[PDB]
Scaffold this active site. Sequence first.
Site, PDB file in Angstrom:
ATOM      1  N   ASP A 148      -2.879  -3.198   5.056  1.00  0.00           N
ATOM      2  CA  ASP A 148      -3.147  -4.720   5.165  1.00  0.00           C
ATOM      3  C   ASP A 148      -2.537  -5.407   4.248  1.00  0.00           C
ATOM      4  O   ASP A 148      -3.327  -5.522   3.590  1.00  0.00           O
ATOM      5  CB  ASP A 148      -3.762  -4.704   6.809  1.00  0.00           C
ATOM      6  CG  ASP A 148      -3.678  -6.074   7.423  1.00  0.00           C
ATOM      7  OD1 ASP A 148      -2.463  -6.758   7.680  1.00  0.00           O
ATOM      8  OD2 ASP A 148      -4.717  -6.808   8.380  1.00  0.00           O
ATOM      9  N   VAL A 149      -2.247  -6.406   4.874  1.00  0.00           N
ATOM     10  CA  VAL A 149      -1.234  -7.773   4.001  1.00  0.00           C
ATOM     11  C   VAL A 149      -2.847  -8.959   3.595  1.00  0.00           C
ATOM     12  O   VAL A 149      -2.924  -9.073   2.656  1.00  0.00           O
ATOM     13  CB  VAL A 149      -0.454  -8.133   3.993  1.00  0.00           C
ATOM     14  CG1 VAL A 149       0.739  -7.827   4.222  1.00  0.00           C
ATOM     15  CG2 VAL A 149      -0.551  -9.168   5.644  1.00  0.00           C
ATOM     16  N   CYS A 185       7.344 -11.237  15.362  1.00  0.00           N
ATOM     17  CA  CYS A 185       7.962 -12.267  16.440  1.00  0.00           C
ATOM     18  C   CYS A 185       7.323 -11.806  17.988  1.00  0.00           C
ATOM     19  O   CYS A 185       7.816 -12.218  18.627  1.00  0.00           O
ATOM     20  CB  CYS A 185       9.318 -12.144  15.866  1.00  0.00           C
ATOM     21  SG  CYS A 185      10.326 -10.780  16.654  1.00  0.00           S
TER      22      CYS A 185
HETATM   23  N1  SAH Z   1      -1.240  -6.993   9.546  1.00  0.00           N
HETATM   24  C1  SAH Z   1       0.768  -6.558   8.913  1.00  0.00           C
HETATM   25  N2  SAH Z   1       0.376  -6.761   7.678  1.00  0.00           N
HETATM   26  C2  SAH Z   1       1.659  -5.216   7.253  1.00  0.00           C
HETATM   27  N3  SAH Z   1       2.480  -5.433   7.993  1.00  0.00           N
HETATM   28  C3  SAH Z   1       2.210  -5.426   9.487  1.00  0.00           C
HETATM   29  C4  SAH Z   1       0.687  -5.866  10.106  1.00  0.00           C
HETATM   30  N4  SAH Z   1       0.986  -5.877  11.045  1.00  0.00           N
HETATM   31  C5  SAH Z   1       1.986  -4.994  11.174  1.00  0.00           C
HETATM   32  N5  SAH Z   1       2.439  -4.931  10.020  1.00  0.00           N
HETATM   33  C6  SAH Z   1       4.007  -3.700  10.724  1.00  0.00           C
HETATM   34  O1  SAH Z   1       4.485  -4.680   9.648  1.00  0.00           O
HETATM   35  C7  SAH Z   1       6.054  -5.169  10.737  1.00  0.00           C
HETATM   36  C8  SAH Z   1       6.539  -6.097  10.813  1.00  0.00           C
HETATM   37  S1  SAH Z   1       7.748  -6.431  12.079  1.00  0.00           S
HETATM   38  C9  SAH Z   1       9.438  -6.775  11.680  1.00  0.00           C
HETATM   39  C10 SAH Z   1       9.621  -5.466  10.558  1.00  0.00           C
HETATM   40  C11 SAH Z   1      10.832  -6.203   9.332  1.00  0.00           C
HETATM   41  N6  SAH Z   1      11.801  -6.743  10.007  1.00  0.00           N
HETATM   42  C12 SAH Z   1      11.401  -5.045   9.139  1.00  0.00           C
HETATM   43  O2  SAH Z   1      12.067  -5.021   7.766  1.00  0.00           O
HETATM   44  O3  SAH Z   1      11.210  -3.963   9.965  1.00  0.00           O
HETATM   45  C13 SAH Z   1       5.698  -3.929  12.637  1.00  0.00           C
HETATM   46  O4  SAH Z   1       6.441  -2.988  11.944  1.00  0.00           O
HETATM   47  C14 SAH Z   1       4.310  -3.725  11.894  1.00  0.00           C
HETATM   48  O5  SAH Z   1       3.760  -2.506  12.391  1.00  0.00           O
END
Ligand code: SAH
EC number: 2.1.1.37
Lengths: 288, 211
Positions: free
Chosen positions: A74-75, A98
């Site tokens: 996770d970030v 989004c």
């Molecule tokens: N807290 C988080 N930290 C990192 N990634 C996450 C996250 N929460 C969701 N994600 C994941 O990170 C992605 C962000 S959604 C958009 C992804 C981006 N536009 C692309 O180039 O694909 C999603 O697939 C989701 O599964």
Amino acid sequence: HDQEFDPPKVYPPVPAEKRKPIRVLSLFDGIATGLLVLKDLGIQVDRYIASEVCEDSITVGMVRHQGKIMYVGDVRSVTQKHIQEWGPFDLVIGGSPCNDLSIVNPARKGLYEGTGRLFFEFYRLLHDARPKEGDDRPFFWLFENVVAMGVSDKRDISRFLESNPVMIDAKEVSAAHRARYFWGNLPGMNRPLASTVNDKLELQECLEHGRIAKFSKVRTDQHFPVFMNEKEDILWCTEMERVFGFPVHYTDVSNMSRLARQRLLGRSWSVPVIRHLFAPLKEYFACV
Amino acid sequence: KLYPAIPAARRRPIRVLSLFDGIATGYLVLKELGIKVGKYVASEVCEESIAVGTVKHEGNIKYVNDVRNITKKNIEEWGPFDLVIGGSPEGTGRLFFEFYHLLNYSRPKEGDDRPFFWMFENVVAMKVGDKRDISRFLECNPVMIDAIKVSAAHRARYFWGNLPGMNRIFGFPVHYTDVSNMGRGARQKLLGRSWSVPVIRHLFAPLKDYF
Ligand SMILES: Nc1ncnc2c1ncn2[C@@H]1O[C@H](CSCC[C@H](N)C(=O)O)[C@@H](O)[C@H]1O
């Protein structure tokens, strides 16, 4: 819309004798579109760090890049110490989820919910990966989001990132109808869409054999946009990859269903749009 | 985290960046701390507390029409701020991330040994996810100062900042709380709800030693 005013920082071009490969931090990677585009442009990648949660996206990256990707979880687990111990970065990229930023939801929760506020996580890692004053190293960053946002949301994002969001529509370079905002400081941020002849502009070039396109392009009536043997059929996943600019049979990495491949390909970036955006980096960094 | 102390002979005025405060708490409380404050910044979307601040404090304040207008040029134009405070009046995360965004641009860079002091306070209505994520954002842990050992009405706040004297030594003050105000219902609305007097003087206490 001129609400804020700030000049974009243009970095001086580095010659070939002081030319170095790229270090890339990719926060909300998902499907590894960024490193795919970088490998397609022929750019040497010294380090690629993707902080991805979803195991299907991590599987996409492990199959399509063969252990080159350094995975974080996770970030929120990333601190300033992790940024300063993994070397200085040359390219930071990402697009926040989004779920609550899109105004297509009637009951949207907004920017400050756990799906939207992850953007601020990006800003925090934008604050850690940015070099301090006095360093003339070319540092580049890119944030992506949808067009269906509020005025106050887009205004606050543009003020926080301190850049002008350029609107890029996938229909000018590919066969998809999606307009996306791109914050960043890349050179030629608002230069027009140089359509490549290798890119599939029409929809029918993305179809397989035996299928006729009903529309000219697809969106992101109780019918289906492709006729198949005089019968309306659902748009295929590999055809969706060809529409979104991905290589043929890209997101077939594990035992995931059709709905999982739809959920991955929907959230993914458009390959031609990125290829356009990452194009001027070739003269600032290493080539292969 | 401990920083070396400057000698107190260097008497320099304090540059204050007060965010989403409304009624000017920092300028007034630093005037009655006993040190000379240099310049004060005030901005708030609502008009009532801006009217109170432009009638009360006689116009010795740089005012900004909206908190959505301060850029990096507005930070570097009005001098580097020694003190950065956030005074609390779904805009909770809005006010916090405005504070954090402006705190990131007022923080001294690697090489500046300037004594930088900041302060954030928030209500006890915080989600556990908000708690752990914001504690990741600020890279610190707040302290609970309560009004069960010092007052009758319920006031509980948790504080982040660079202000020492916050681990074990602090207990409950005795004099300023009992000489602060009398408790009636309109006064419960005005000065009992007010977060200017109770702890903020103690948090500005170790700042007058440096300047
Ligand atoms: N807290 C988080 N930290 C990192 N990634 C996450 C996250 N929460 C969701 N994600 C994941 O990170 C992605 C962000 S959604 C958009 C992804 C981006 N536009 C692309 O180039 O694909 C999603 O697939 C989701 O599964």
